[PDB]
Amino acid sequence: SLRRDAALKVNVTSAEGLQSVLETNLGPKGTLKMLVDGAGNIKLTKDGKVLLTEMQIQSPTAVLIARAAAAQDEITGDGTTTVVCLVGELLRQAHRFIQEGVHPRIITDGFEIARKESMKFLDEFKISKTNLSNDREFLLQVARSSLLTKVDADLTEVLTPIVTDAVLSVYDAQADNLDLHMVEIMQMQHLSPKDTTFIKGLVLDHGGRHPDMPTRVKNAYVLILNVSLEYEKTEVNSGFFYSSADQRDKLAASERKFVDAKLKKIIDLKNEVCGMDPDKGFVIINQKGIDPMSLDVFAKHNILALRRAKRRNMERLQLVTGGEAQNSVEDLSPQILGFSGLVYQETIGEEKFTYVTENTDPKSCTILIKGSTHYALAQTKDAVRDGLRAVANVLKDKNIIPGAGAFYIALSRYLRSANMNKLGAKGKTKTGIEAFAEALLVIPKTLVKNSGFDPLDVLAMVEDELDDAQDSDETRYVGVDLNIGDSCDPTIEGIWDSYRVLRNAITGATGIASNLLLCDELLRAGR
Amino acid sequence: AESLRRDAALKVNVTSAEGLQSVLETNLGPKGTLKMLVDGAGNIKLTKDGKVLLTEMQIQSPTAVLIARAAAAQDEITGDGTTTVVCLVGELLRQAHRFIQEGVHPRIITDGFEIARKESMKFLDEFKISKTNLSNDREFLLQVARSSLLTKVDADLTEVLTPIVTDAVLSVYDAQADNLDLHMVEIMQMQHLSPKDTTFIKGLVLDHGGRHPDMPTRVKNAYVLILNVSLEYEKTEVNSGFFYSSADQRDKLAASERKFVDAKLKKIIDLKNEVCGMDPDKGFVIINQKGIDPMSLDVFAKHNILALRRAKRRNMERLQLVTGGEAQNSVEDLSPQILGFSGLVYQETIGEEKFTYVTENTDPKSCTILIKGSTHYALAQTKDAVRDGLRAVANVLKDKNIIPGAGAFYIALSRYLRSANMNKLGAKGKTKTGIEAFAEALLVIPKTLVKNSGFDPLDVLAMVEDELDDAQDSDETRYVGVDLNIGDSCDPTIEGIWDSYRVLRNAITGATGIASNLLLCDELLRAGR
């Protein structure tokens, strides 16, 4: 009286809706999506994972898709949208086989067999790149892969030297690793995004405000001042008793002698070492505040005074400059002074930034992203953080893979002809391998669809070119050119993808998409 | 003032085609299902013929209208494959509809079919097998006749109709160039006896026979003589009667009615004395299309002369060919050469109707297929199986080429067309996308036969491909086909499953143009009112 429930037709269709959304924004020809919270928050981001965190989906099928990208950002850091396109399209290709009566286990097991065979073809297709530091010229084209995706390509040439020189400056040449936490990103509005420049040192928030402070100081010594220069009180509890206002200044000056005594010891250090020597300077950090009386004292000696510094930024100044933190003025020593180059302070009424740049061994970098609007700050920041992590796996892993659908078209061609020659799996496995082979061709068709060129013509020109290369007995890599619409050589164009990015993308999208077909029924319980 | 376009049709046309496809999908093959269709007539009829299904149902959907016209053209030419073509048109639209979302233009889809159709004719000429016109092929004709019979019945009736259908064509058709005529084979319908007891009739049978208790049951070697004169009393055009009040007036008034009767009757009984008087084991039979008077009933009983009355005019014209005797309008001009020749003549005894067997003739040059059944729907199904069997064998004698069935032609053609364009690469890069849809659409037939039987269509597909791979390495020729009973592959030459060449030749070309025209309509046009 009861037979099964057929099930399905709910998870595949719900996953098809998420694919159509993320199909348009994939690649450098994609689109920039905008989300609205309703409280006044507006964010424009082309990344898939960043958008899924701000979107609530009731369908549990798309929930695991967002959770599948959690391991991609923490490891690969790039290609979150590409993984989603491989999960959705694989379900559409398998949908036709399910209606024919094919059991999903063979469909699931057929994907794992093709996944292990893809790893063998993955090691043959990859190219080993040397660890020499002369590859920076080659790293310029590699950095463009992440940049051209998130922007309109007008700011790519500006951000190309900034992202490239940020990692290589803090990285000595050895195996080691690279740490992107040492690169701080700050933002200031009321300026154009084309003014973005590279900062070698650290940018400080609160700048010195005074007309007589020197703007440019070359070869100045950095000194960390931990004592408070603000108003001080007597070490014992007392009070100010004055009959007239003239008597109050006498009692107030008694407590000011404690600060004035420390200021006389600081100014003596400047004239002691290279006081009258040209091209010399003395700069006081002074994390704590500054009283209004010391502004005129430091102005006569052309000393840069700063106050209200963040505790986190002070830890980097000790590494960049080298000067130790001096708690007491009586214990101040000439060896505490550090080293710095030309320091120029940009004058702006809203904010004033102090440049710590031009140091011998800074071991730090700063990427300053400035834009007038709100979306200009978030869009560029998404491209830099994705650009630093894309190059991160390039220097760590010696293997590099060409992009623009080079590996996707090649692997789909290899797995097609290899299944007929081997025939060691099973006769019913062909349905799982053919579905996986056709699911890899959606990425080159997705990139060209956003450009407007016919995806049918670009598919035929690449397949006809690969067949002519085998008869010529040589190795020639072919890729999809989005600008012209024909094929291209990915080695000459400069489109390259990291090995660790595509390794977890194919493996990750295979295991998550296979688990979706394994669901027999959706149960609602707990309420 | 916008250039945005719509589909609105192809998605509905394929959906309407998939609905009609599933109706005839389970109705195809010997293992298919038999569906009942009754529209307004209260008459139960069960048949698997695809053409009869569409004519008995009124479909408002415009998609099934063109499909209905495709079955009418295949019956008037090929006479078979009505359901197979419908299954090919519907499945081809499914593979073509998936490429529409990709952006494939329907003209290249139609152009890709013409390229694959011309290439299919090259493989069609190599795969076909020429059959000899020799009359020793009756053993091979038994295997071909069962292929058409097993489809429309439960397979229990096939063994009964196997000798009947095979001997029906060979008996009426002498072996020469000539031609064959299926209209010369009579068809009689009877609802009395069960269909398991049906038999073949070599001669001609008639409806109304003579009824007398003393008529002989069996008459061997009887002479057939056509008699056009009335042996029954006749009356004036105006109603009148002869009433006698005395015994003397009885013979006076009755003599006027028997004057024409006695003149012809006395001359007929003289023929029995001069001809066939002494000769034993012979008989004499009178046709007598008109009625019979009660006076001649006693005369025919003493001489054991079989009497007949109320004969069909169309049947008497064929009696001149079977028996050989010419129609005699006047007994005065009757000659001894007018008497024909017939074999054993015996009449079955049934209360409602009676039969007459002219069978066992030297040169009958005619046949009669007697259809028996208990119910009404059993007669309609059996009549459909006989008419489909005669037209299937009709193309066997006309066309010397024969093709094996059971998916042997479709699997080999779908595999050949896929590997032919990859090696040659002489068509186009974009066109081969639509060509693959035509190759995958030819594998639905072997998957449909195993679907009704409950077998895995993917399992039987991989088993055939494994056998074809071993056949490509060796230089010999070995054909592979799907076995529905066992579930594994089979040799179609040993099993005996064969399909006509003319039916399958117009099936590929016919289904190509019908399925292509459905893809050429972008927008449905509603006008005229």
Side-chain angles (χ1 to χ4, degrees):
Chain A
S1 179
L2 66 319
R3 296 293 179 267
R4 295 191 298 273
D5 78 313
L8 214 271
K9 280 185 199 176
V10 176
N11 291 337
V12 176
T13 300
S14 296
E16 293 176 350
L18 178 63
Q19 185 176 356
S20 178
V21 175
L22 295 175
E23 183 178 2
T24 59
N25 63 345
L26 177 62
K29 302 300 183 181
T31 59
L32 177 60
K33 294 182 181 297
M34 175 178 70
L35 295 176
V36 176
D37 189 6
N41 189 341
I42 295 171
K43 294 177 179 177
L44 278 66
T45 300
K46 293 176 179 177
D47 187 5
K49 182 173 178 290
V50 176
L51 296 175
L52 294 175
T53 59
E54 296 301 321
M55 295 184 287
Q56 295 300 321
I57 295 170
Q58 186 174 355
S59 178
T61 300
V63 176
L64 295 175
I65 295 170
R67 294 182 181 175
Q72 295 300 321
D73 181 67
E74 296 301 321
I75 296 171
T76 60
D78 187 5
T80 59
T81 301
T82 300
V83 176
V84 177
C85 296
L86 296 175
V87 174
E89 183 67 14
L90 181 63
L91 297 176
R92 181 173 294 107
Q93 294 300 321
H95 183 198
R96 183 180 65 256
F97 295 159
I98 294 170
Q99 294 178 336
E100 296 301 321
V102 177
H103 191 278
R105 182 179 66 84
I106 296 170
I107 295 170
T108 299
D109 290 344
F111 296 160
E112 296 301 321
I113 295 171
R115 181 178 64 84
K116 294 177 179 177
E117 295 301 321
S118 64
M119 296 297 103
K120 294 177 179 177
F121 296 159
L122 177 63
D123 290 344
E124 294 177 350
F125 180 80
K126 64 182 179 181
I127 295 171
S128 296
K129 183 180 67 64
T130 187
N131 291 336
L132 179 63
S133 63
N134 194 30
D135 59 353
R136 181 180 180 274
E137 183 178 2
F138 177 80
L139 295 175
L140 296 175
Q141 294 177 335
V142 176
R144 293 182 182 175
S145 178
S146 63
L147 295 175
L148 295 174
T149 300
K150 298 294 180 65
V151 299
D152 291 344
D154 290 344
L155 296 175
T156 299
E157 294 178 351
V158 176
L159 296 175
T160 299
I162 295 170
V163 176
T164 299
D165 290 344
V167 176
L168 296 175
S169 296
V170 297
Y171 176 77
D172 291 344
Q174 61 180 19
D176 194 5
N177 58 33
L178 61 84
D179 185 5
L180 296 175
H181 182 62
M182 294 183 287
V183 176
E184 295 301 321
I185 295 171
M186 293 178 70
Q187 63 180 19
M188 178 176 70
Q189 294 178 336
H190 300 290
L191 292 174
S192 64
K194 294 177 179 177
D195 290 344
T196 299
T197 188
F198 178 80
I199 302 301
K200 294 177 179 177
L202 178 62
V203 176
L204 296 175
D205 187 5
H206 187 278
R209 294 182 182 175
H210 191 278
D212 289 344
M213 290 179 180
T215 299
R216 295 183 180 276
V217 176
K218 183 178 179 180
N219 290 336
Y221 297 141
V222 176
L223 177 63
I224 304 300
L225 183 65
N226 193 30
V227 65
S228 178
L229 295 176
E230 293 178 350
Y231 176 78
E232 294 178 351
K233 294 177 179 177
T234 302
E235 294 178 350
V236 296
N237 290 336
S238 63
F240 296 160
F241 295 159
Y242 62 92
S243 64
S244 178
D246 290 344
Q247 294 177 336
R248 181 178 64 84
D249 290 344
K250 294 176 179 177
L251 296 175
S254 296
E255 294 178 351
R256 294 181 181 175
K257 293 176 179 177
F258 296 159
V259 177
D260 291 344
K262 294 176 179 177
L263 296 175
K264 294 177 179 177
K265 294 177 179 177
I266 295 171
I267 61 172
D268 290 344
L269 178 63
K270 183 173 179 290
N271 290 336
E272 182 178 2
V273 176
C274 296
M276 295 300 294
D277 291 344
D279 290 344
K280 301 292 183 291
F282 178 79
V283 176
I284 295 171
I285 302 301
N286 192 30
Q287 184 175 356
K288 293 177 179 177
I290 296 172
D291 57 351
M293 293 178 70
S294 296
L295 296 175
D296 291 344
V297 176
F298 295 159
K300 294 176 179 177
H301 300 290
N302 290 336
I303 295 171
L304 177 63
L306 296 174
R307 59 177 182 182
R308 294 182 182 175
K310 184 178 179 180
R311 294 182 182 175
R312 179 59 179 165
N313 290 337
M314 294 300 294
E315 294 178 351
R316 293 178 179 84
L317 295 175
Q318 294 178 336
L319 296 175
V320 175
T321 60
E324 296 301 321
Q326 185 63 59
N327 291 336
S328 296
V329 177
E330 183 178 2
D331 291 344
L332 177 63
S333 296
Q335 294 178 336
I336 305 301
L337 296 175
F339 178 80
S340 178
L342 176 62
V343 175
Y344 63 92
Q345 185 174 355
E346 183 178 2
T347 299
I348 294 171
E350 294 178 351
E351 293 177 350
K352 294 177 179 177
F353 296 160
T354 300
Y355 295 140
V356 186
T357 63
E358 294 179 351
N359 291 283
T360 299
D361 290 343
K363 294 177 179 177
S364 178
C365 294
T366 299
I367 295 171
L368 178 62
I369 295 170
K370 292 188 295 185
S372 296
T373 59
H374 300 290
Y375 63 90
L377 295 174
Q379 185 175 356
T380 301
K381 184 178 179 180
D382 290 343
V384 175
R385 292 175 296 180
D386 290 344
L388 295 175
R389 291 174 295 181
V391 179
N393 291 336
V394 176
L395 296 175
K396 294 177 179 177
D397 187 4
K398 63 182 178 181
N399 291 283
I400 191 66
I401 295 170
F407 176 79
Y408 296 138
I409 295 171
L411 178 63
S412 178
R413 181 179 180 273
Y414 296 142
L415 295 175
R416 182 182 64 196
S417 63
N419 190 30
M420 294 177 182
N421 290 336
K422 294 177 179 177
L423 295 175
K426 186 179 179 180
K428 294 177 179 177
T429 303
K430 294 176 179 178
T431 59
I433 295 171
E434 183 178 2
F436 177 80
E438 294 178 351
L440 296 175
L441 296 175
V442 64
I443 303 301
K445 293 176 179 177
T446 299
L447 297 175
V448 65
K449 183 178 179 180
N450 291 336
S451 178
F453 180 79
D454 187 5
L456 297 174
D457 290 344
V458 64
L459 178 63
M461 294 183 286
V462 174
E463 293 177 351
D464 290 344
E465 183 178 2
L466 295 174
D467 291 344
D468 291 344
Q470 295 300 321
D471 291 344
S472 63
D473 187 5
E474 63 184 343
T475 299
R476 185 176 179 84
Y477 296 139
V478 177
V480 176
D481 186 5
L482 297 175
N483 290 336
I484 295 171
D486 59 9
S487 64
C488 57
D489 186 5
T491 60
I492 295 171
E493 295 301 321
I495 295 171
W496 292 92
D497 290 344
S498 178
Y499 175 78
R500 294 182 182 175
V501 175
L502 296 176
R503 185 176 179 84
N504 290 283
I506 303 301
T507 300
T510 300
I512 302 301
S514 296
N515 291 337
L516 296 175
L517 295 175
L518 295 175
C519 182
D520 58 352
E521 184 179 2
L522 178 63
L523 296 175
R524 181 177 181 171
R527 184 177 179 84
Chain B
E2 294 178 351
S3 178
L4 295 175
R5 189 177 64 256
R6 298 293 182 190
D7 187 5
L10 298 176
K11 183 178 179 180
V12 177
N13 290 336
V14 174
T15 300
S16 296
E18 293 177 350
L20 178 63
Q21 185 175 356
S22 296
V23 175
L24 276 67
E25 182 178 2
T26 59
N27 293 337
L28 177 63
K31 301 299 182 181
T33 60
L34 178 62
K35 293 177 179 177
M36 175 178 70
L37 274 67
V38 177
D39 186 5
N43 189 340
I44 295 171
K45 184 185 292 179
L46 277 68
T47 186
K48 294 177 179 177
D49 186 5
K51 183 178 179 180
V52 178
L53 297 175
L54 296 174
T55 58
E56 295 301 321
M57 294 185 288
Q58 186 174 355
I59 295 170
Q60 187 174 355
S61 178
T63 300
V65 176
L66 176 61
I67 296 170
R69 294 182 182 175
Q74 295 300 321
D75 181 67
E76 294 178 350
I77 296 171
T78 60
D80 189 4
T82 59
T83 301
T84 300
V85 175
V86 176
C87 296
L88 295 175
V89 175
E91 183 67 15
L92 180 63
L93 296 175
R94 296 176 63 185
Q95 295 300 321
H97 187 278
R98 183 180 65 256
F99 295 160
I100 295 171
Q101 295 300 321
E102 184 67 15
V104 178
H105 191 278
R107 182 179 66 83
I108 296 171
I109 295 170
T110 59
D111 290 344
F113 295 159
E114 296 301 321
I115 295 171
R117 181 178 65 84
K118 294 177 179 177
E119 295 301 321
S120 296
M121 297 297 103
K122 294 177 179 177
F123 177 80
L124 178 63
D125 290 344
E126 294 177 350
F127 179 80
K128 64 182 179 181
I129 295 171
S130 296
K131 181 61 174 172
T132 59
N133 290 336
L134 179 63
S135 64
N136 194 30
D137 59 353
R138 181 179 180 273
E139 183 178 2
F140 177 80
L141 295 175
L142 295 174
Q143 294 177 336
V144 176
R146 293 181 182 175
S147 178
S148 63
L149 295 175
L150 294 174
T151 300
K152 298 293 180 65
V153 299
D154 290 344
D156 290 344
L157 180 63
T158 299
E159 294 177 351
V160 176
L161 295 175
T162 299
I164 295 170
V165 176
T166 299
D167 290 344
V169 177
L170 296 175
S171 296
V172 64
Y173 174 77
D174 187 5
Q176 288 178 336
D178 290 345
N179 57 33
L180 60 83
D181 187 5
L182 296 175
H183 182 62
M184 293 177 70
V185 176
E186 295 301 321
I187 294 171
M188 182 64 73
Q189 185 174 355
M190 177 178 71
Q191 63 180 19
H192 294 82
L193 295 175
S194 64
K196 293 166 62 181
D197 290 344
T198 187
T199 188
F200 177 79
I201 302 301
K202 294 177 179 177
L204 178 62
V205 64
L206 58 82
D207 187 5
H208 300 290
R211 294 178 178 84
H212 189 277
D214 290 344
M215 294 297 103
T217 299
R218 295 183 180 276
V219 176
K220 183 178 179 180
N221 290 336
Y223 296 140
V224 176
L225 177 62
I226 295 171
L227 184 64
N228 192 30
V229 300
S230 178
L231 295 176
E232 63 183 343
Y233 297 141
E234 294 178 350
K235 294 177 179 177
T236 304
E237 183 178 2
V238 295
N239 290 336
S240 63
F242 296 159
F243 295 159
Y244 62 91
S245 64
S246 63
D248 290 344
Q249 294 178 336
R250 181 177 65 84
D251 290 344
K252 294 177 179 177
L253 296 175
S256 296
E257 294 178 351
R258 63 181 296 176
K259 183 178 179 180
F260 178 80
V261 176
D262 291 344
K264 302 293 183 291
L265 178 63
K266 293 176 179 177
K267 294 177 179 177
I268 294 170
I269 61 172
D270 290 344
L271 178 63
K272 184 173 178 290
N273 290 337
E274 294 178 350
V275 176
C276 187
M278 295 300 294
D279 291 344
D281 290 344
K282 293 177 179 177
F284 178 79
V285 176
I286 295 171
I287 301 301
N288 191 30
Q289 185 175 356
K290 294 177 179 177
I292 296 171
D293 58 352
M295 183 65 73
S296 296
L297 296 175
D298 291 344
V299 176
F300 296 159
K302 294 176 179 177
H303 300 290
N304 290 283
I305 295 171
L306 189 147
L308 295 174
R309 59 177 182 182
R310 298 293 180 86
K312 183 178 179 180
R313 181 178 64 84
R314 294 182 182 175
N315 290 337
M316 292 177 70
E317 294 178 351
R318 293 178 179 84
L319 294 175
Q320 294 177 336
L321 178 63
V322 176
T323 60
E326 296 301 321
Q328 185 63 59
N329 290 336
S330 296
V331 179
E332 183 178 2
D333 290 344
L334 176 62
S335 296
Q337 294 178 336
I338 305 301
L339 296 175
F341 177 80
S342 178
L344 177 63
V345 176
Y346 63 92
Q347 295 178 336
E348 184 178 2
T349 299
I350 295 171
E352 294 179 351
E353 294 177 350
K354 293 177 179 178
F355 295 158
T356 300
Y357 296 140
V358 185
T359 63
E360 294 179 351
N361 291 283
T362 299
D363 290 343
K365 294 177 179 177
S366 178
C367 294
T368 299
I369 295 171
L370 177 62
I371 294 171
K372 294 177 180 177
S374 296
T375 59
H376 299 290
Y377 63 89
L379 294 173
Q381 184 175 355
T382 300
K383 183 178 179 180
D384 290 343
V386 174
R387 291 175 295 180
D388 289 344
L390 295 175
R391 292 174 295 181
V393 178
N395 290 336
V396 176
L397 296 175
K398 293 177 179 177
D399 187 5
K400 63 182 178 181
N401 291 284
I402 192 66
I403 296 171
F409 176 79
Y410 296 138
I411 294 171
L413 178 62
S414 178
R415 181 179 180 273
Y416 176 78
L417 295 175
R418 185 177 179 84
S419 63
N421 191 30
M422 294 177 182
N423 290 336
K424 294 177 179 177
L425 295 175
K428 181 61 174 172
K430 185 178 180 180
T431 301
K432 64 182 178 181
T433 299
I435 296 171
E436 183 178 2
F438 177 80
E440 294 178 350
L442 296 175
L443 295 175
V444 63
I445 303 301
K447 291 166 62 181
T448 299
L449 297 175
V450 296
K451 183 178 179 180
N452 291 336
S453 178
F455 295 160
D456 186 5
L458 178 61
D459 187 6
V460 296
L461 178 63
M463 293 178 71
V464 175
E465 294 177 351
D466 290 344
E467 296 301 321
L468 295 175
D469 290 344
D470 290 344
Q472 294 300 321
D473 291 344
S474 179
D475 290 344
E476 63 184 343
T477 299
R478 181 177 181 171
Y479 296 140
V480 177
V482 176
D483 186 5
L484 296 175
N485 290 283
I486 296 171
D488 59 9
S489 64
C490 56
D491 186 5
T493 59
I494 295 171
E495 296 301 321
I497 295 171
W498 293 92
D499 290 344
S500 178
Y501 176 80
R502 182 177 181 172
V503 176
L504 296 176
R505 185 176 179 84
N506 290 283
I508 295 170
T509 300
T512 299
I514 301 301
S516 296
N517 291 336
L518 295 174
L519 294 174
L520 297 176
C521 183
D522 290 344
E523 182 178 2
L524 177 63
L525 297 175
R526 181 179 180 274
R529 181 177 181 171

